[PDB]
């Protein structure tokens, strides 16, 4: 089901040894893994848990707990997601392709979270009172749209092409 | 069972076989061309596999022909690239079982098509 | 109410996610719990703009 085989190649060789000279044949197969389970059961996930997060800009800015929950809910989705993950398989310690992807939307999803408190700073603490509030919402419903739309372009662009 | 139809027949250069399959491919996963002509005996021509898309091709045609498959329309095609006059033949599409023995025995197969003559 | 559903919707698909191999392709049960999420994920766009408009 993972994989299907683009090749398998015959060799022969000597192998040495302390003991003497031995005969090898290899038999060897070229693996590469279908992505289709993955964009079902984990990439999509991801991407709607990170859609998610952009209801929050049209949510009212005074309803600050609605705007709380649904980050915070955001960003503890995208923690369990990413620690789920890795039970899965070997515990090898550097990071793979997927891990890069959801450390990705874990910035972003938390950057969002970041932004509520910016603007709830600036709306009940520190033009500022009235307009820079409903301001940052505005930038926000398609910075960040646009701005995790050109992270997930250029990822597929590296790993896939290149 | 498994119901194979062939288009791509007539006299010839280069030209296109095709065979279209209905029914329980599941269980046949693999499809095989063949050809048969007067006085000699029926040929394995290659091999495709349903969602697998690997071949294997027999050594007269290797480098000459290929095969390839439409899973969603479920359709086997083999490019019939630079024929030469001894390929004229009637070409078979065939079915193989999941268990059955070698690819190049006719024998292992079960559902066959009708089969498209070819003159070169 | 809405995101407790999204994240109840999600909480399915992690359970089947384990009980069958690791296919690539869409099952029939796939294509359900996938129109389920819709459904329940529109439910949560339904107040996102509902909530918009009126306050707006
Ligand atoms: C999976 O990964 C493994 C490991 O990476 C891959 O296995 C390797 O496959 C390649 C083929 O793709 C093998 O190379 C062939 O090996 C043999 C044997 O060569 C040995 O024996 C010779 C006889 O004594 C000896 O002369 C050789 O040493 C000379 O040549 C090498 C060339 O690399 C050179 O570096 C040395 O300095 C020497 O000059 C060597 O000990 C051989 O028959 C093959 O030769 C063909 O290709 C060469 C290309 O230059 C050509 O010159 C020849 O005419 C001939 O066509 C070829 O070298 C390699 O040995 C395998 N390595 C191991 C460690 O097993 C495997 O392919 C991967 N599989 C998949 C599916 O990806």
């Known amino acids: 089901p993972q994989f299907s085989i683009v090749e398998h190649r015959l060799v022969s060789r000597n192998v040495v040894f302390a003991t003497g000279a031995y005969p090898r044949l290899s038999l060897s197969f070229r693996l590469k893994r279908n992505i289709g389970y993955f964009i079902l059961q984990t990439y999509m996930p991801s991407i709607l848990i990170t859609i998610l997060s952009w209801v929050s800009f049209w949510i009212n800015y005074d309803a600050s707990a609605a705007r709380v929950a649904l980050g915070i809910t955001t960003v503890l989705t995208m923690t369990t997601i990413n620690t789920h993950l890795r039970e899965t398989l070997p515990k090898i310690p550097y990071v793979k392709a997927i891990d890069m992807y959801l450390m990705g939307c874990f910035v972003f999803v938390f950057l969002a979270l970041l932004e509520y408190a910016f603007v709830n700073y600036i709306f009940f603490s520190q033009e500022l009172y009235k307009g820079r509030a409903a301001a940052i919402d505005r930038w926000s419903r398609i910075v960040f749209p646009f701005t995790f739309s050109l992270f997930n372009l250029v990822y597929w662009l590296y790993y896939v092409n290149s | 069972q498994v119901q194979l139809v062939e288009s791509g027949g007539g006299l010839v250069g280069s030209l296109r076989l095709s065979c279209a399959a209905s029914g329980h491919t599941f269980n046949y996963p693999i499809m095989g061309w063949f050809r048969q002509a007067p006085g000699k005996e029926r040929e394995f021509v290659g091999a495709?596999?349903?969602?697998?898309?690997?071949?294997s091709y027999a050594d007269s045609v290797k480098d000459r022909f290929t095969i390839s498959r439409d899973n969603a329309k479920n359709t086997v095609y083999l490019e019939m690239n630079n024929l030469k006059p001894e390929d004229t033949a009637v070409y078979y599409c065939?079915?193989?079982?999941?268990?059955?023995?070698?690819?190049?025995?006719?024998?292992?197969?079960?559902?066959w098509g009708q089969g498209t003559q070819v003159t070169v | 109410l809405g995101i407790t559903t999204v994240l109840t919707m999600t909480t399915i698909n992690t359970h089947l996610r384990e009980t069958l191999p690791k296919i690539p392709y869409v099952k029939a049960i796939d294509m359900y719990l996938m129109g389920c999420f819709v459904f329940v994920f529109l439910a949560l766009l339904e107040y996102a703009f509902v909530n918009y408009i009126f306050f707006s």
């Open positions: 065939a079915a193989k079982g999941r268990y059955s023995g070698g690819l190049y025995y006719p024998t292992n197969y079960d559902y």
């Open positions: 495709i596999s349903w969602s697998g898309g690997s071949t």
